[PDB]
């Protein structure tokens, strides 16, 4: 699967759910309007993509990279925010997901599947029980990341990530490129196949709450999976 | 932390919950009774074992070795399975946690918080659908193993663990040496400090189920962690 | 450190060595000139990069991707191949480091000290004999790399690579996304505080043979790169 | 392959090469005498061992455990190192291998293949530039370990070496549990069918200079491995 968005045009490639919107400017906004209390929004590629294969065993690289932006509005405290996911085919928005579940994980369940690499602006009583506030995490089947480091939140800053995930060897590994020339990289490692079925959707989770809110905009997304085939 | 138990006495250094009791020779039997319906079974080194120390930033590694059988009872189908785990301390055997998810998974829960190593003798929705029966698997916060291979579950056969916590790498490995004489590995990256709080328990839980059951006997444990306090 | 050249200027930057040279269009030629017979080429970035600080033991993170293509020239077979490498600053081009040895390996030493991600035009004996003819490899200290991943060089294809270093886990990760939509990925754990000094080059090193040859040429390189002080 | 020396016979069970002897009590003595000058012995197991297979591509799992000594002679600095190693199935002692060198690198070469875990006396300038003096190494292809930790190297102490190859993940990890009763661990990701052949030899070469010298005296040597030929 390969795609490459350098602005967003509803063109039928995306599926939006919630408050998922393409504003102008080509944006695309998660929420449309963070001053609607306790959104959700998806956004994800339009067909799904193929992780692995049952006849091989084979499982799929990819690498992505989007540069997106949270911003703050206006004297409210900033949340929830903003995840890169792979879940199933056929999920939906879960329920009990608002908030700091980020719009893909209910909550209670259990039982919850789904790889996440999140940017989470809001530190819940679950994250990184560390004087992390904002955070860049990668979950698996778990609203508390398997790590996280810490993120330099910066509303309206652009940030610039790209996540490789290495089927050899099984890593899903994450690069944050700040606006100050910083980095941040995180890395899990995650047998696709031993936790996602052979079809997910891959794109975008966000949420809000209330009175604590902020904007999700995504600029540009570019994507590139090769699943072998055999 | 370093003990090493060539049998099992009732000598108030380690915590038995629900069906655990040492059971005849110094046998750790979880449970004690496969015939009582649905047991979930807790045995847990009594002291918290310091896995990362917040002042230094270190990371204990560890390493520990169990022996162990699973059996048959009676004509009944095997499960669920026995695992050693690392959890926050002040873990109790958690509600919902019956059967497959081994004493550890609340699976109404979301929030579960721990470190284990599955000998998962029962295929349930959520396990290997590889075709593996029996496999070891290793879980971090789900029931559902981030990687796992298949076990060759041998009523009445002695299995040799080792499991090796590197925190320089920060790689958990397991090999499980049969009564065949074959071994079987299976490992994960896994950042206890991201993970886990700074003590943990370790130990054991196991379940059966109604009218799935068998035993779960332990007849060895040694267990060696080392800290940097520098 | 953080650059970016979306191309190549004459600017200082950069350290050329050997055959390394701004051409047309501002490209990154490695070699200038193939037709010339056997060439060792070298461009780095010209200040060190810090990768380790003594204090703390912390090492860098980094994000690096470049954009490149190698041709055919015309009718000799392709050698040898371009590497992206960190090296001791003050590196050299090696003795003894012609052709398949990528102008990083002294042939008759031993001492190597290097971590690269090369792009394999030639199997030499070493190379892997699997038939992969060329190949993408993460090497470190040796021409024979670590881990490789077949690829399907295709003379004049633009070839977009990003390598992500994560710190936290130790691990550099590959991804090359083909002109075709498809990426192949490969991916090492590696500490770079072990191999390596706590300064270094980024940069190219690429050789040609005779008869066998190639253009490498790298169109654009962007590179972020974050050690934490405290 | 599975074997299991609790103390080591003159039975034509392994291959003695250079120095290595069955010393008193059935130690191997590797050098049988430590006053001669830079001394090298291999201790291999008489038998290849299959580490991967052709037709499947799988590699095997192993877990080995050794525990040795080394101990100064007096008046002499101590000096080289022990390592457990694999090598190419016909491997000999390489020329140019003496002393830091550790009867496993060709300090004139290149073109190295072998996979060590080195338990290094002797700090050479290639050594861990931690101040580490001795250190306990994961090696490939070169003489330069991919990772080290540091050994507090007691003459005459009883050191307990356990490695696990997991084929899964690709991890070599070794823990060493020390006289102290403390662990010492590291590992390195090594997927042993890129840097080794089918069949090698698994066992231990060690090293002597002048005047630096020590005993590296081997007690017991189990291992099993396991490769799945389906
Ligand atoms: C500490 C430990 O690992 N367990 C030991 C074992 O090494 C030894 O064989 C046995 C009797 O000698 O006592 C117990
Ligand atoms: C790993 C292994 O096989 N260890 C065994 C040990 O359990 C046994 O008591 C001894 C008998 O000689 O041989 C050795
Ligand atoms: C390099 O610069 C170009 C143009 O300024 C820009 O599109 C891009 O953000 C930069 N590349 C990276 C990866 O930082
Ligand atoms: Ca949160
Ligand atoms: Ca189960
Ligand atoms: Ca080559
Ligand atoms: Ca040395
Ligand atoms: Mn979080
Ligand atoms: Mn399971
Ligand atoms: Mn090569
Ligand atoms: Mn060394």
């Not at 949270?70 to 409210?76: A, C, E, K, P, T």
């Not at 599947?113 to 004087?131: G, I």
């Not at 999700?216 to 055999?230: A, G, M, N, Q, R």
């Amino acid at each position: 699967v390969s795609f490459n968005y350098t602005r967003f045009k509803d063109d039928g490639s995306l599926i939006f759910q919630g408050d998922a919107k393409i504003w102008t400017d080509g944006r695309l906004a998660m929420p449309t309007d963070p001053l609607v209390n306790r959104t959700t929004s998806h956004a994800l590629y339009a067909t799904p993509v193929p992780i692995w294969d049952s006849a091989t065993g084979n499982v799929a690289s990819f690498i992505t990279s989007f540069s997106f932006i949270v911003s703050n509005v206006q004297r409210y405290p900033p949340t929830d925010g903003v995840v890169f996911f792979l879940a199933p085919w056929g999920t939906e928005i879960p329920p009990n997901s608002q908030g700091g579940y980020l719009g893909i994980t209910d909550s209670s369940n259990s039982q919850n599947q789904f790889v996440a690499v999140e940017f989470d602006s809001h530190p819940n009583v679950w994250d990184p029980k560390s004087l992390r506030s904002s955070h860049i995490g990668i979950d698996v089947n778990s609203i508390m990341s398997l790590k996280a480091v810490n993120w330099n939140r910066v509303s309206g800053s652009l940030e610039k990530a790209t996540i490789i995930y290495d089927s050899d060897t099984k890593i899903l590994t994450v690069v944050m490129t700040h606006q100050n020339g910083q980095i941040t990289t995180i890395s899990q490692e995650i047998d696709l196949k031993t936790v996602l079925p052979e079809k997910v959707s891959v794109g975008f989770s966000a949420t809000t709450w209330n009175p604590e809110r902020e904007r999700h905009d995504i600029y540009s997304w570019s994507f590139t999976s090769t699943l072998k085939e055999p």
